[PDB]
């Protein structure tokens, strides 16, 4: 009953400041981006097999700044302020703002080499709480962790936060952005006009 | 410490009428019929090894109407309000309400052929969310959804919703009724007065 | 590259007069049913590598009229207007209005033996024009047909006509409904919004 | 990824009256002890290989009173109110209050023989709800579980209730003490600070 | 009767705005390239053994500006209009219009490993349409999509979609250009005068 | 599903000129010839497993003249109009308008050796566009080809160009006619009259 898919998608366009800005993003189908999100909706649960955030470059080699990636699991722990607090997380990884071109290889799912430059993470997956988790749509979550927080933990995996910092301007400057690469399995369909 | 029970016993009397009726059913021990919930009840938690829903008639050939079953997980996603929407959901069975005979097979326990007829559906069990699941009552479940529905994943592997159409008086007619057939293992024993 | 799904899902309704009634319906994602319709749409091509459109009653057995199923290839062909001509069709089938109940044995996914008497129909697949069709939207494709009806067949596999008659009204009677059981891989997904 | 610890410590004080006294602790890091406390919340998330409380004597062979252990597995459930219904529970062990000085061997992780006096108790750890959970503060969840208790079961696999009667004093009497031995599986490092 | 060919060759010239500029070409012998159009002409069809479009940079590592590349396989779709719709696309790469140098090595046909950062994107081939296509002459082609898109499927197996944006000045730089390496299989030779 | 059939019948009556003349006509079912025309029209599509057209002489060893003949692929494609261009095509064969008698061991079925001389010329089959073709009528095909050109391919595999020239008199003479020998795979059957 699984229908198993592999894709990359665009996730989110990223830019740089010289004051460090910390964000996060939830590990969920509909989250994810706009493709994942629409096929997903049409299965009632789903599992991640493999899910893995790349950052991709598209500035000159000489942007100044740098962007910082990693995993949390407990929606309710407070997420990282620092570069320090968040290296500390699993899966941190760091680099240049211009750096990570290497991290195609991953995209493309073409099979490469010279990745140790690449600016890529991927998910436990095997340690997550559990393996099947229900389609949720961020509206309904939102309003779930509105009660309390750690409604969330049944509901989502896990969050990615990121960092960005070192730039030379105050004002946001277009650096990269970061596609997400997974491998999922949906199952239990449902018609997508009753999935919450 | 694991008890293992197979057993068959009814869960629903069904009745038609000349409009569509959409119900639901949670999966879980309390629900399913009141032998189960007696039993259950003197054990912490459990975990559905197989649960099917067998629809048996009860009316005449010429008895106008059709049963459709089929299950939902995330119970904050919305119920079907249709037989197409129902149609997608997973284990969809559908039949004349004074079909499905060949169902008893499955509740006597006793291995037959002659299936194909059969108005009875099965639950992933591998796919739910998790394996154990705690004896609920309806009343403590109740109380949780009320606060917020997906405080229900964590409490329930899923619902069984039903539609009952085409009948030809628009007072209930009695088709026929559903039974519940399971191997259930009970672990982690408890004094039936406390669990809730 | 390939995404492999199984499903099953209510294709159209039925129902009876006592003058023969021909009608038919596209083999393509698009059409099959509104669920694979939205799913189907994430991909810019697809394959059949099983259909079968299965009819299920919902009336007593006391009901007059029958079902008549085939097959067609060449969309420029004219439909069959008589049971006569639609009994030389590829994967004819036909039976009691009333009758077709072991055919939920395919629906359900479920391996059963009484199937003689199903009135359920499968799909050439291996002798399809061609094995990768592009999603169509009817719109799109109702305009290319306009054009003219042989620029269709690049576009579609087959189509599925569906005869009834022998009915005991002049007025429709709702006699039952044909679902669709489909295994198909998409390939090349594709923004839906895109998908034309 | 995984940081596998094995590891005794204090867990509560124990003393004895003439009435009952019923009580508990959930068996999560954070209230085992104040060690492990501080150890776990360096990571997001852990698992319970095994977890044993195991009571040890103080008092001399004439002190009156008699302990009594025992797990629950659904926050939600009421708390046992007598010795008869605490019997019921899985893992139930009882003792006279200055009996069990052989549960040292477990303590000790020595390998030894004559236990069949110590009262001490283990956990189902592979019948839990999940293996992995996340480190909760009692703050973060008493929250939790003041929205609602089923909030908890998600972030708990347990609780121990004791109880403590046949005393010869109305005012308590020191009897010994419960240490708790586990073998934990510590993941995904965090930034102790931001654990909640 | 096959004539097999492996070469690589200039396909396009690419420059840089601070606007998004999304355009495509059809992946047919006409259109890679001037050199292969002549070659094809002489044959009546062809088959793609191999297609793959690589990006190589002519500006320095200080330019501003990115490139997004992938395929479409139904003509009447609609062309993306945006990277996140191109992201979804398949064989979707992106990368800094500077970077891409390691491609080089697949058009030089050399064997290499630091191919990670190369920006170039290969064709299905096998899960095209139709294997053996006709030789056209974008003229012809144009006349037919003229009177209906559809009539190109059975034309052209796929068109690449490309995407440049991020860069600095609002009139175009020159960045860099895209080659095309294939493997083309023709057959059925012809005088290139009658090839339409 | 496949009826499989081998036949020779007649195909066309040649006659010669002191000017050059070319003809061309479509390689399929409806054209061949009246007999597979009738024959074929009861099945809904079919594939060439192998066609092959064979020139029989009729005239005296004095006749001037010699025939030509050559296979083209795409009915866009303009049809040669010279000795030189035709004997570019595929399969191009060459000879005396009143040689070629050795042909006959192919019509008759039966094995030879003496075939060197033979103006006969067999069709790719392998390489065609696809397998399975549409039973198309001139009629339907005419008025599609009249759209656009292009909408044949789809619709057909091959033409067969002839060109006749090299004879003493300006009035057509009787040299002799062309049969087709194929074995052809016809599949779904359909009432003959509803074949376009
Ligand atoms: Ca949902
Ligand atoms: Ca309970
Ligand atoms: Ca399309
Ligand atoms: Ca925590
Ligand atoms: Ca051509
Ligand atoms: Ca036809």
Request: glycine residues 8%; hydrophobic residues 40%.
């Amino acid at each position: 009953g699984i229908t198993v898919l592999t894709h990359s998608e665009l996730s989110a366009e990223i830019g740089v400041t010289d004051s460090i800005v910390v964000s996060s993003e939830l590990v969920m189908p509909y989250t994810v981006g706009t493709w994942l999100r629409g096929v997903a909706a049409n299965w009632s649960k789903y599992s991640w097999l493999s899910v893995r955030y790349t950052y991709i470059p598209s500035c000159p080699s000489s942007t100044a700044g740098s962007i910082h990636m990693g995993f949390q699991y407990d929606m309710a722990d407070t997420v990282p302020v620092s570069v320090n607090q968040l290296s500390n997380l699993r899966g941190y990884v760091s680099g240049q703002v211009w750096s990570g071109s290497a991290g195609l290889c991953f995209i493309n799912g073409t099979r490469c080499s010279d990745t140790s430059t690449a600016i890529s993470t991927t998910l436990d997956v095997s340690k997550l709480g559990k393996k099947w988790y229900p389609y949720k749509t961020s509206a309904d979550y939102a309003t779930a962790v509105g009660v309390d927080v750690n409604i969330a933990t049944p509901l989502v995996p896990a969050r990615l936060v990121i960092a960005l910092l070192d730039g030379s301007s105050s004002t946001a400057v277009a650096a990269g952005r970061i596609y997400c690469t997974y491998t999922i399995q949906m199952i239990e369909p449902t018609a997508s006009a009753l999935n919450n």
